[PDB]
């Protein structure tokens, strides 16, 4: 795929849900898929959420520095409950603002990992996807664990990622499992726009 410049953020979930093998298996993904997603023209940016909400680098942070292993080896999990639809909006309002290095013309993606359900979240998700869309953000999303395998959770899936859900929801069964769809997900990024 011919590469054009891309701003790809993430956005982890750092909950008490998730224990710290697990969050440190969480780590090494996000470090790994920056780590093959590096060419010329991409920037990387990574936000924790819980019930409070940490940017660990911004765009213009990792042009500086564009390193994402040791960006992301040193973060602390924040622990709490899981905010996720804040989170979505303080991706877009934070992340992908020019203040933060986000590029004008630059393809905008956002790949979300959550471990659980929305809760505690004064915001739903009606309240933060029509503006992430607007503002043209492609959101894929990784729902990790037992939380997402039943047919009815998906949905809330579906309700973060862009449409059509099939090309950008993942369901991994446990963190050790994130690392089989590391190819698949490049690809997809990779080739956003061919």
């Given at each position: 795929?011919?590469?054009?410049?891309?701003?790809?953020?993430?956005?982890?979930?750092?909950?008490?849900?998730?224990?710290?093998?697990?969050?440190?298996?969480?780590?090494?993904?996000?470090?790994?898929?920056?780590?093959?997603?590096?060419?010329s023209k991409t920037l990387f940016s990574l936000?924790?959420?819980?019930?409070?909400?940490?940017?660990?680098?911004?765009?213009?942070?990792?042009?500086?520095?564009?390193?994402?292993?040791?960006?992301?080896?040193?973060?602390?999990?924040?622990?709490?409950?899981?905010?996720?639809?804040?989170?979505?909006?303080?991706?877009?309002?934070?992340?992908?603002?020019?203040?933060?290095?986000?590029?004008?013309?630059?393809?905008?993606?956002?790949?979300?990992?959550?471990?659980?359900?929305?809760?505690?979240?004064?915001?739903?998700?009606?309240?933060?996807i029509p503006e992430a869309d607007r503002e043209?953000?492609?959101?894929?999303?990784?729902?990790?664990?037992?939380?997402?395998?039943?047919?009815?959770?998906?949905?809330?899936?579906?309700?973060?990622?862009?449409?059509?859900?099939?090309?950008?929801?993942?369901?991994?069964?446990?963190?050790?499992?994130?690392?089989?769809?590391?190819?698949?997900?490049?690809?997809k990024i990779f080739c956003i726009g061919s």
């Amino acid at each position: 795929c011919p590469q054009e410049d891309s701003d790809i953020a993430f956005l982890i979930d750092g909950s008490g849900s998730i224990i710290p093998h697990d969050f440190r298996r969480m780590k090494e993904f996000v470090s790994t898929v920056m780590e093959q997603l590096k060419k010329s023209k991409t920037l990387f940016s990574l936000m924790q959420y819980s019930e409070e909400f940490r940017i660990h680098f911004t765009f213009k942070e990792f042009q500086n520095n564009p390193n994402p292993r040791s960006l992301v080896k040193p973060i602390t999990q924040l622990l709490g409950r899981t905010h996720t639809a804040t989170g979505i909006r303080k991706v877009v309002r934070e992340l992908f603002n020019i203040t933060n290095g986000a590029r004008k013309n630059a393809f905008k993606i956002l790949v979300v990992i959550t471990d659980g359900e929305k809760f505690g979240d004064p915001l739903g998700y009606e309240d933060v996807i029509p503006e992430a869309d607007r503002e043209g953000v492609i959101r894929y999303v990784i729902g990790v664990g037992d939380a997402f395998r039943s047919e009815k959770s998906r949905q809330e899936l579906n309700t973060i990622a862009s449409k059509p859900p099939r090309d950008h929801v993942f369901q991994v069964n446990n963190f050790e499992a994130l690392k089989t769809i590391q190819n698949q997900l490049r690809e997809k990024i990779f080739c956003i726009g061919s």
